[PDB]
Amino acid sequence: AGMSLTQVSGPVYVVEDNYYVQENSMVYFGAKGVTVVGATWTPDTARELHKLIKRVSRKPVLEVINTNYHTDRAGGNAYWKSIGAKVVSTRQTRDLMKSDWAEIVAFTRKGLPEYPDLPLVLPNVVHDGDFTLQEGKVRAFYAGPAHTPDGIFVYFPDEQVLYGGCILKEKLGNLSFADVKAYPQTLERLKAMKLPIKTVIGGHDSPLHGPELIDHYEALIKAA
Numbered sequence: 001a002g003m004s005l006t007q008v009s010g011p012v013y014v015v016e017d018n019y020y021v022q023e024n025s026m027v028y029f030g031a032k033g034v035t036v037v038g039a040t041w042t043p044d045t046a047r048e049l050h051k052l053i054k055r056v057s058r059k060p061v062l063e064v065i066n067t068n069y070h071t072d073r074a075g076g077n078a079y080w081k082s083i084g085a086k087v088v089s090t091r092q093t094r095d096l097m098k099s100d101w102a103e104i105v106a107f108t109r110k111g112l113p114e115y116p117d118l119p120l121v122l123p124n125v126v127h128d129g130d131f132t133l134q135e136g137k138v139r140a141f142y143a144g145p146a147h148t149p150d151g152i153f154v155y156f157p158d159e160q161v162l163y164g165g166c167i168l169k170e171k172l173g174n175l176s177f178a179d180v181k182a183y184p185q186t187l188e189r190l191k192a193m194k195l196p197i198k199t200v201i202g203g204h205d206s207p208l209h210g211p212e213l214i215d216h217y218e219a220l221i222k223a224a
């Protein structure tokens with residue numbers, strides 16, 4: 001289908017969003033409500049994800065995290081705000097979105113002319129540091145610049161699942177916004193945290209991998 005939502009471990013689900021360039025995002029089904037990690041490409045793809053969420057749980061969608069300021073992680077924001085969900089990001093992501101949204105939309109449309117000219121929709125919950133949701137079961141952190149200056153990781157300690165949004169994936173992908181020399185330093189900072197990881201979900205290409213996706217991508221970026 002256009003979008004799928006599949007259980008990875010317990011309350012942790014992976015979204016495969018096949019619109020435009022395939023992007024993978026996360027959903028966490030909590031006791032009081034649902035957290036979406038990555039807003040998906042557009043308001044219409046966000047509505048498609050909501051439809052799948054509502055076949056799994058009746059609990060409200062409480063918040064959606066923009067793991068960077070780009071279209072594939074924040075494009076759905078209009079829809080999520082419209083249904084009362086908070087849109088959550090770091091201060092750095094929010095500030096880059098304000099100044100650079102028009103630029104990323106135009107860049108996205110160069111490769112994907114069919115992609116809509118979406119108006120700016122900013123996060124309404126903004127964090128100055130690392131942060132958690134779902135009583136500490138969803139943990140968002142910054143470990144330096146990589147694919148964009150602002151990209152964050154989201155870790156799910158109970159399930160030992162790491163999501164890196166656009167940072168981790170199978171193919172080199174698009175480096176036009178990246179800090180190529182810092183990229184492996186950020187991945188090494190991440191590895192030095194020694195997080196128990198069983199599963200890494202890539203933000204593009206096939207989602208399900210083990211911890212070695214980090215090493216895979218590190219080696220690719222060091223050759224770029």
Ligand SMILES: C[C@@H](O)[C@@H](C(=O)O)[C@@H]1NC(C([O-])O)=C(SC2Cn3cnc[n+]3C2)[C@@H]1C
Nearest residue numbers: 021070071072107108166173174176177204
């Ligand atoms: C700058 C781009 O990077 C960004 C965009 O232009 O919106 C968005 N995120 C990527 C990325 O590398 O994470 C790309 S996805 C990347 C590019 N190619 C094309 N098809 C698959 N791959 C993965 C996507 C359009």
Ligand SMILES: [Zn+2]
Nearest residue numbers: 072166203204
């Ligand atoms: Zn991306």
